[PDB]
Ligand binder design. Sequence first.
Ligand SMILES: [Mg+2]
Ligand SMILES: [Mg+2]
Ligand SMILES: [Mg+2]
Ligand SMILES: [Mg+2]
Ligand SMILES: [Mg+2]
Ligand SMILES: [Mg+2]
Ligand SMILES: [Mg+2]
Ligand SMILES: [Mg+2]
Ligand SMILES: [Mg+2]
Ligand SMILES: [Mg+2]
Ligand SMILES: [Mg+2]
Ligand SMILES: [Mg+2]
Ligand SMILES: [Mg+2]
Ligand SMILES: [Mg+2]
Ligand SMILES: [Mg+2]
Ligand SMILES: [Mg+2]
Ligand SMILES: [Mg+2]
Ligand SMILES: [Mg+2]
Ligand SMILES: [Mg+2]
Ligand SMILES: [Mg+2]
Ligand SMILES: [Mg+2]
Ligand SMILES: [Mg+2]
Ligand SMILES: [Mg+2]
Ligand SMILES: [Mg+2]
Ligand SMILES: [Mg+2]
Ligand SMILES: [Mg+2]
Ligand SMILES: [Mg+2]
Ligand SMILES: [Mg+2]
Ligand SMILES: [Mg+2]
Ligand SMILES: [Mg+2]
Lengths: 52, 147, 51, 134, 128, 187, 53, 124
Amino acid sequence: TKTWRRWHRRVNTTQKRYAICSALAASALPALVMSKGHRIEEVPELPLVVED
Amino acid sequence: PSRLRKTRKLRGHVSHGHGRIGKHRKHPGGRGNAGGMHHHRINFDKYHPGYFGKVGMRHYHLKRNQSFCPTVNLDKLWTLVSEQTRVNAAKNKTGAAPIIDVVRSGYYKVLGKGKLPKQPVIVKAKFFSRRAEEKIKGVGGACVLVA
Amino acid sequence: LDDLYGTWRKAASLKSNYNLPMHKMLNTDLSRILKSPEIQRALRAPRKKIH
Amino acid sequence: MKFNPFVTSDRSKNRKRHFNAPSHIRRKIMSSPLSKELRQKYNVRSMPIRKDDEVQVVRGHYKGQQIGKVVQVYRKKYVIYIERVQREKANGTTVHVGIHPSKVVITRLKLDKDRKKILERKAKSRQVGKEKGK
Amino acid sequence: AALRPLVKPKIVKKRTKKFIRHQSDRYVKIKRNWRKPRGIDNRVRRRFKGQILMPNIGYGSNKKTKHMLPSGFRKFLVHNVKELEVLLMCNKSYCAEIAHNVSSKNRKAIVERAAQLAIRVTNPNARL
Amino acid sequence: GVDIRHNKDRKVRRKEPKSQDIYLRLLVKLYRFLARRTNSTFNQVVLKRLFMSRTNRPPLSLSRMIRKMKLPGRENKTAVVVGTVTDDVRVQEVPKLKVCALRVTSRARSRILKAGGKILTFDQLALDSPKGRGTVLLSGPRKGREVYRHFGKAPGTPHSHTKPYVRSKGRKFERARGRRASRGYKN
Amino acid sequence: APSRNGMILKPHFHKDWQRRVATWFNQPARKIRRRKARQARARRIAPRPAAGP
Amino acid sequence: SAHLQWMVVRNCSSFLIKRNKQTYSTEPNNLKARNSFRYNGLIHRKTVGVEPAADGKGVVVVMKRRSGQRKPATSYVRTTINKNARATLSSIRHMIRKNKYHPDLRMAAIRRASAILRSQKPVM
RNA sequence: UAAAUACCGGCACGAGACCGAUAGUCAACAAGUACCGUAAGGGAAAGUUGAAAAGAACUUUGAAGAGAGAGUUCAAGAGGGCGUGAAACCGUUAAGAGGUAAACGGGUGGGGUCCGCGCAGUCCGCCCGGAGGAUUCAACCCGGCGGCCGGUCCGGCCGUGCC
RNA sequence: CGGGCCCAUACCCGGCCGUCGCUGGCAGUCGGCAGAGCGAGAAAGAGAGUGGCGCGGACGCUACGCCGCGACGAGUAGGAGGGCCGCUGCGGUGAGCCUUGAAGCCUAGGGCGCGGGCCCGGGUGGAGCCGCCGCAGGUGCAGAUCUUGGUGGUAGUAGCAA
Ligand SMILES: [Mg+2]
Ligand SMILES: [Mg+2]
Ligand SMILES: [Mg+2]
Ligand SMILES: [Mg+2]
Ligand SMILES: [Mg+2]
Ligand SMILES: [Mg+2]
Ligand SMILES: [Mg+2]
Ligand SMILES: [Mg+2]
Ligand SMILES: [Mg+2]
Ligand SMILES: [Mg+2]
Ligand SMILES: [Mg+2]
Ligand SMILES: [Mg+2]
Ligand SMILES: [Mg+2]
Ligand SMILES: [Mg+2]
Ligand SMILES: [Mg+2]
Ligand SMILES: [Mg+2]
Ligand SMILES: [Mg+2]
Ligand SMILES: [Mg+2]
Ligand SMILES: [Mg+2]
Ligand SMILES: [Mg+2]
Ligand SMILES: [Mg+2]
Ligand SMILES: [Mg+2]
Ligand SMILES: [Mg+2]
Ligand SMILES: [Mg+2]
Ligand SMILES: [Mg+2]
Ligand SMILES: [Mg+2]
Ligand SMILES: [Mg+2]
Ligand SMILES: [Mg+2]
Ligand SMILES: [Mg+2]
Ligand SMILES: [Mg+2]
């Protein structure tokens, strides 16, 4: 093995932002959150917002 | 991902996909692209015609910066300015024509490839072609030279 | 967050040039689409007789 | 979580340091908690063990409520010997059973000037810490 | 009174012997785990008369009886009590199977819950 | 003991999209149902094209779209593309168009809307016209890719205008022996 | 040996190229060091423009 | 929507058990406890769930309301039923059929109710 | 003539989708050591009792190694190259068999060691009849919750809607 | 030259397995707000209008799913597909397993899969291990007069005789 194996990868900014948007959109669905496994049953509203 | 490659499916087969009769030897044809005239000659002729020999003159100290000359076409000519300019020019009644600076945009020579909308213009270019100038005149307008 | 990632009409202001990605299909309620009058009108009768 | 970029989380490095610490670091490692009454009256939670302190055994086969006097602190093997924590050998000789100081609670300290200085230093540090915290 | 499945068809297996690796009887370094012979002169590969058979696809069992235990059920590995409500509604077709790693105190509870729920257990008195 | 050959028994066509796009799979489900339950071949062609790879559904430009929609007879119909509709810059006047496509570039969308047309998705198309009645089915130039200038009769062969694979274009790069009449032969 | 239609190439790997292979694993460290030296110089020259003359 | 959520969770959920050539889903409101679009208990606007009462007698029937989709805390209304078997079955059957509350699964609901009542019945 | 630049040696450091004692440095251990060569040079093998030595007092046969008892330990089935302890190979016990070397595939038969904790044989719903016991059914009243609506009830919010 | 008879993996009938094709069928589970259908030689409506008591109805559809029709099945060199085949490590997940006993090892025990292999039972052992979704690789041995280590038959033999 050599140290100059291609360790790192390169991703376009447009699709990185695409993935962030998709993750945020999925994080607002109780079905998806409970499928991920969080115990959000007693949470009042899923996009949980608290004051400053 | 080495788990998706052909080497994982060749485990168990004796020859690893390279045949028993003619083994996988080391360099059975020569290193690199040698033999281009003797035993790879017809490959070189059938896919690389003109690969051998000399042709033309030699230039000792070339300067791409010296030879630099970008070109634009009349098809793309009107895209170099805001379409607000085109709307105002086609709307007004005085007849004043907008000014285009292909040098400012980043072009030097203007080639005339396609249609030009019927609207008077003035083009400030470094070089012109005969047909580009003819089409600009046929639209009705001027070509000026800049340095 | 809205200012960060922009809206459908308003592009992101904290990104030099960014706007939200578009949808290839809008109505994702496939069952609602299938059992709608306009579609259900233009079908042939189902064949569910096992031969 | 540890944020100091100059101390290790390396298991091997921590084990090597612990098992190769010199004697004056062995002393610091060999610390035992004071009893409830001593802790209340000194505001100090722990004290490195000494040769002649009365202690109790809290865990193991010898756990109980008896007060035993330390005999010797065997820093090389990380164990301490108490005056009546011992078993019977084959021939009939009674040898001591080593116990780690972390499983032992101190009952009455052996006070001298330096020990008192250590106690007052620790008490002052806890007082300033509590003043800062509250 | 053991529990019965919904239906108990006559299970037919096209073969009951196992396919042993060729020439594994003559060596100890060679396990019986089947490896396909690839030799140029191998009579087993060439399918000579009276040799070891090879696992064709034509030996595949009936899909209606595939994986059915001789009791008529199909096995399901379970590790704790919460995985028996899974088989609650597959009562007559599927049995339960406690892992080897579960300890006796939990095996007792699993067996008791399964007896309550009428789910069959294939190893009900394993450790005790 | 049957005298048949099994070379071409297995067809090679695509039975499903290769992609894992969930939206594309939802569209494929919808149009599978439509093409199975109707007697219109528009749906069959549409899902055939939905199955295809990106190279087999090239982008379609506003220039081609406008020309093909301004062809006589096919007025105020809906143009359907199973590919991408892309903005064209050397066009000046955009008519009121009616477009359905998998995706439209941002500037082309702006041009179409400002002209005053409408852009649809395929589910909206299925709701508007389940049988595809009153539609114009178009597709971009399949042979616009640059790889097709390298295919065909090999170069260095008479009457073959096939581009060669050269690392760079210039005077010293593959122009002497097989290309000149002075340097031996010209094919 | 060339095979069918391809583009014949000239890789410059006939020297002892593996002896000289300059990796860039210390690139983030170099960026951090450059930025820290930049801040140090800027704070050293207290009121003067940070970008020199 | 339900179909989109199913396309997300059909193979990458935390309630999914895949062993012994069998597949199962362990979300709370899933009758028949099977990985299925129809019987999934999370992705639909309206589901039901038959669970045994914590008292150990009777069943609890869960209905999902119409308004609070994004409000998990006040989304499921629970109905505890402690009666005899036939009338419990009749009550569940009416709650489904008369309300027309996702009628695809009334038979599955009453099968689960009968199983739970049998389980609550002491063993011989 | 400083800076931006290079660094498999050295003094300290920190970390790892790395190897885990035939691996990783040759070197996890008294390793450039033992040893070999006249010399230049060549160059290994080798980790693990237990939590704690509590490392087997004492009795007895023998010159003794070595045994039989006793004892420690949770465990000697951990007894100073002692965690776990596989294969090749060997001894013994039990069973079977034995003039075409042994061995093998297909089909049966015979005998074994074990399993079923088999040995009076399944049940699940509806109806008729016989004996029993209940807070006990329908309808009605009060209260709470929920689902679908008001052709076109009043009030809100939202638009990849417009004016 | 005549009747009869014997049998191959060939041919016929039947069952099961897989592949290929029909780019076949199924969103119609439209149920008291209801009215059960699309298989039958021969195109296209269970078309709309205008005048002459008792409260009931199995399974289904991980649509990457299920179901139905036919045909087909040799294979070295070689190609491709599917692995709920196997090994080590990482990101998530299993309110996972574990001193009332993990890994590993042995097993005339019970089984599953065509197979790669896997799951239980018994014993030993004494501290850690695994399932599913993805990611990565120093990832699977019967051979190389292969490397290292150990052990056999020869064999209680040749020999211990200047
Ligand atoms: Mg082959
Ligand atoms: Mg090959
Ligand atoms: Mg060979
Ligand atoms: Mg060759
Ligand atoms: Mg080669
Ligand atoms: Mg600190
Ligand atoms: Mg041959
Ligand atoms: Mg063939
Ligand atoms: Mg072919
Ligand atoms: Mg070749
Ligand atoms: Mg770090
Ligand atoms: Mg070793
Ligand atoms: Mg080593
Ligand atoms: Mg080892
Ligand atoms: Mg190893
Ligand atoms: Mg060892
Ligand atoms: Mg240890
Ligand atoms: Mg033990
Ligand atoms: Mg041991
Ligand atoms: Mg041992
Ligand atoms: Mg033996
Ligand atoms: Mg015998
Ligand atoms: Mg047949
Ligand atoms: Mg055949
Ligand atoms: Mg074949
Ligand atoms: Mg241990
Ligand atoms: Mg590795
Ligand atoms: Mg080997
Ligand atoms: Mg002799
Ligand atoms: Mg002699």
